[PDB]
Amino acid sequence: EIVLTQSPGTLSLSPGERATLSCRASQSVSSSYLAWYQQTPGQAPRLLIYGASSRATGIPDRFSGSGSGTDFTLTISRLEPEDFVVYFCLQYGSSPLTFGPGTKVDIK
C-alpha cells in the first residue's frame, strides 16, 4: 500500500496566522487523488480538499491544497479558533485507500 507521512506532528500558531501542513507519499499518488480531512474531537472526519486542490462544498476559502506526485500541502490562510484540531491526508490513487497519521494544530 501507499504510506502517507504528515509534518509537523504538532503545529503551534496564533489565531490569524498562516498554517502550512505537509503530506508526503511513499510513491506517486495517481491523478493527484489526495484529499484533506479536518477532525474535531467527537466528530466524523470533515472533507476540506479533494483532488489535491479542489475545495469541497461549503468549505471556507481560507482552506486551499496544492502539490502532486509525492508532495502535498494544506494551507489555512488565516487560522480561526475552530481550526485548532486534527488534519489527515487521504490517498485514493491506489487500493487500498490509506490515511496519514495526522497533524494537530495547537494555539501558541
Binding site: 491523478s31 486542490s53 479542489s54
Partner: protein, 274 residues
C-alpha cells in the same frame, strides 16, 4: 482616405503569392480540476450569499486566446509604402460536438431504465479574429464576488460593476485567466478585431451546433478593410461553453470543446507611419 488602426490603408497587393492561409485548434479552458476530466469545470456550487461568494478557480471557465506569428513581408521598414497581412475571411466550428452522443459515461439517468442525461443548459459560443489582442469590458453578476488567485477579474469593483463601469478594461493577454462570467468583448474598442458571440441561458437549453467546411465569415469592415496584423501577429480568441454535464449525484460541470480557425490573409499596402 482610409485610416485603420492608426495607419493609412492603400491598395490590395495583386501578386501570385499575395494570399496565405493560417489555421489553429484552440483548446477550451473550462477549469480542468481533475487531470482525467480535461474540458470539464469543477462541479457548480449553488446558493452562495451575495456577501460571501468565493468561487473555486477550477469552477470558472475562462476565455482561450493564441497569438499566431506571420511571415515578415518588409525587407526594409523605411520604404514609402509598407506591407501588412490583412485577415479577409475565417472558417470556424466547434470540434467534437458528437461526443455529447455518449450517454453511457457518468451522466444521470433521465428516468428509471433510461439513458444518461444529455449535456444541456446555459451555453456561450464566441470567437474573435484581430491584428491586436481582444479588448474586453468587465461586468459582474455580483460585484462582491471574491474571485480566487490565478484569475484576472474587474479590479476595485463597485455596485456600478453589475451594470456598466468603464474602469473595467482588459486585453485578453493570458490563457486560462479571464473568467467568461466577468468579461465580454468591448464594442467601444476592437477597431482591429472582428468578434461574434451568442449567449443562450436557461436550465434545459438544448445545445445546437453546426459544422461545415463550406461556410465563410467575411472579416472586412464597411470600407472593405479586414483586421491588419500589427507586428506580423494575428490573434484568435474563443469561449465555447456547450452546457452542463449532470453526474449520477445531480452535480453539474461545464463542458467545453475546442474551436478550429482557418484565416485567409492577403498583403495590404499601407503608408509608412514613421
Amino acid at each position: 482616405l482610409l485610416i485603420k488602426g492608426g495607419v493609412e490603408v492603400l491598395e490590395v497587393k495583386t501578386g501570385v503569392d499575395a494570399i496565405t492561409e493560417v489555421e489553429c485548434f484552440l483548446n477550451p479552458e473550462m477549469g480542468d480540476p481533475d487531470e482525467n476530466l480535461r474540458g470539464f469545470s469543477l462541479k457548480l456550487s449553488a446558493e452562495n450569499d451575495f456577501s460571501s461568494d468565493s468561487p473555486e478557480r477550477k469552477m470558472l471557465p475562462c476565455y482561450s486566446t493564441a497569438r499566431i506569428p506571420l511571415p515578415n513581408l518588409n525587407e526594409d521598414l523605411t520604404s514609402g509604402n509598407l506591407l501588412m497581412w490583412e485577415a479577409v475571411t475565417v472558417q470556424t466550428e466547434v470540434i467534437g460536438i458528437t461526443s455529447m452522443l455518449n450517454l453511457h459515461a457518468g451522466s444521470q439517468k433521465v428516468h428509471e431504465h433510461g439513458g444518461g442525461k444529455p449535456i444541456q443548459g446555459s451555453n456561450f459560443h464566441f470567437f474573435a479574429v484581430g491584428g491586436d489582442p481582444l479588448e474586453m469590458q468587465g461586468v459582474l453578476m455580483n460585484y462582491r464576488t471574491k474571485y480566487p488567485d490565478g484569475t484576472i477579474t474587474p479590479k476595485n469593483p463597485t455596485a456600478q460593476s453589475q451594470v456598466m463601469n468603464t474602469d473595467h478594461k482588459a486585453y485578453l493577454d493570458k490563457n486560462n485567466a479571464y473568467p467568461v462570467e466577468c468579461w465580454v468583448p468591448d464594442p467601444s474598442r476592437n477597431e482591429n478585431t472582428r468578434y461574434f458571440g451568442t449567449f443562450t441561458g436557461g436550465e434545459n437549453v438544448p445545445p445546437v451546433l453546426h459544422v461545415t467546411n463550406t461556410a465563410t465569415t467575411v472579416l472586412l469592415d464597411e470600407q472593405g478593410v479586414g483586421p491588419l496584423c500589427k507586428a506580423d501577429s494575428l490573434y484568435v480568441s474563443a469561449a465555447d461553453i456547450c452546457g452542463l454535464f449532470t453526474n449520477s449525484s445531480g452535480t453539474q460541470q461545464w463542458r467545453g470543446l475546442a474551436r478550429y480557425f482557418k484565416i485567409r490573409l492577403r498583403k495590404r499596402s499601407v503608408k509608412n507611419p514613421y
